[PDB]
Subunit: 136 residues, 3 copies
Amino acid sequence: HPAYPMPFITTILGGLYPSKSILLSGTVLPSAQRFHINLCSGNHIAFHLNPRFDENAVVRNTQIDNSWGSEERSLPRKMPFVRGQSFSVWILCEAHCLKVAVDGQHLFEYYHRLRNLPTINRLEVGGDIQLTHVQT
Amino acid sequence: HPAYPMPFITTILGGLYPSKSILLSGTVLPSAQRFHINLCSGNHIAFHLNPRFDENAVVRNTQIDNSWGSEERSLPRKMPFVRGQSFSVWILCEAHCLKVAVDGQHLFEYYHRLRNLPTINRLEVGGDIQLTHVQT
Amino acid sequence: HPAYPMPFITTILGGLYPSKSILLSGTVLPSAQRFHINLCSGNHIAFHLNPRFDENAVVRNTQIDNSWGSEERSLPRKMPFVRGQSFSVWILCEAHCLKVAVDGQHLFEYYHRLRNLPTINRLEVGGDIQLTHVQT
Ligand SMILES: CC(=O)N[C@@H]1[C@@H](O)[C@H](O[C@@H]2O[C@H](CO)[C@H](O)[C@H](O)[C@H]2O)[C@@H](CO)O[C@@H]1O
Ligand SMILES: CC(=O)N[C@@H]1[C@@H](O)[C@H](O[C@@H]2O[C@H](CO)[C@H](O)[C@H](O)[C@H]2O)[C@@H](CO)O[C@@H]1O
Ligand SMILES: CC(=O)N[C@@H]1[C@@H](O)[C@H](O[C@@H]2O[C@H](CO)[C@H](O)[C@H](O)[C@H]2O)[C@@H](CO)O[C@@H]1O
Ligand code: NI
């Protein structure tokens, strides 16, 4: 499974909309500090998924231009991402929010801050992981 | 090869057209009963590929709203899908029909019933299989 | 990793544009002679990537209708493709050229000959390889 280049940046033609799903799989590097998945719109980051091993947390936020909003860190269970372990992320878009699952199990919801879904037409993946697959 | 969520539903931007191909791979579960692949248009199922292990057959049909048409079950050879065995499905769209191959070998043709190809813009996969990859 | 059909032909909706990337992975057959990757526009081959084991070279060219232009064969290092060995090709599109990397390492640049990027909307892969994945 040859890896994707990192960072990986690709446009999501048509943008987002209810029932739209973005899937990603790969492996967290052995000594990973952090890695992220961004759903961007022009110059803004509509959704920022930032798992942090240095902080043992999963940070989610939105950046408008140069401004980060208020972070959301709550998790229903233990940090699902593990160093050196393969993973899969399923981002499902709904009308009111994004639903994120990790390794087949729902993890959290993120209410839209940028609601013009069609304008969220760019995916960026970077950080300490080996990206092996993307389904947009 | 992390699996896709099931059922898997994704839009085929631009719909179908001659030379358009949809590829899928995965593994039939050990005790699979049935699984299907649908090419949908709005509220209709333009093409329904339904391999059945309980009946040992490969059923193809079209549903307009709530009405299933006349089923097509003929096969040139033995049922290619096997429980617990990996497979690949290649659906090639032509002007007059869809040509389906399984594991690299042509299996059957399905003449279009819904001929407005561009309107066939949705793919649904469900049933007793582990879906590992899709190329639309 | 079930293989893709060969030759593999798929449309690149929206065509090319700066920052657009096409990724491919697969395995060169044991006794491969040659294989190619084409970025086409209507009836022209905007970009032709033709690794040749019989000549031990990597040929790049453009075909307008029935006319092949002047070939580019220069390589900064040894032929990266090896018979029976897996590989990955990353084609990055920029405003002035295409940047090609093989197995994660930049290999060469190809200045655009057909500059109407959006019109380069078709990918063709053929020849002596087992194509296991494409990301357009
Ligand atoms: C607890 C807390 O508020 N800490 C924050 C850091 O999380 C924050 O780091 C940035 O966070 C954003 C997402 O909110 C991006 O991930 C960015 O890459 C991080 O640098 C810093 C900086 O804003 O502020 C506090 O330390
Ligand atoms: C031999 C025969 O005609 N049997 C049919 C069943 O195949 C049919 O089951 C449905 O078939 C459609 C496709 O034609 C869908 O797969 C659907 O999910 C099945 O339930 C039933 C019901 O229409 O009628 C006969 O039994
Ligand atoms: C050294 C040299 O000029 N040799 C060329 C061949 O490379 C060329 O072969 C064709 O090359 C084009 C790309 O330039 C395509 O790959 C095509 O499939 C090849 O047949 C031949 C024919 O034009 O001319 C010289 O021999
Ligand atoms: Ni893929």
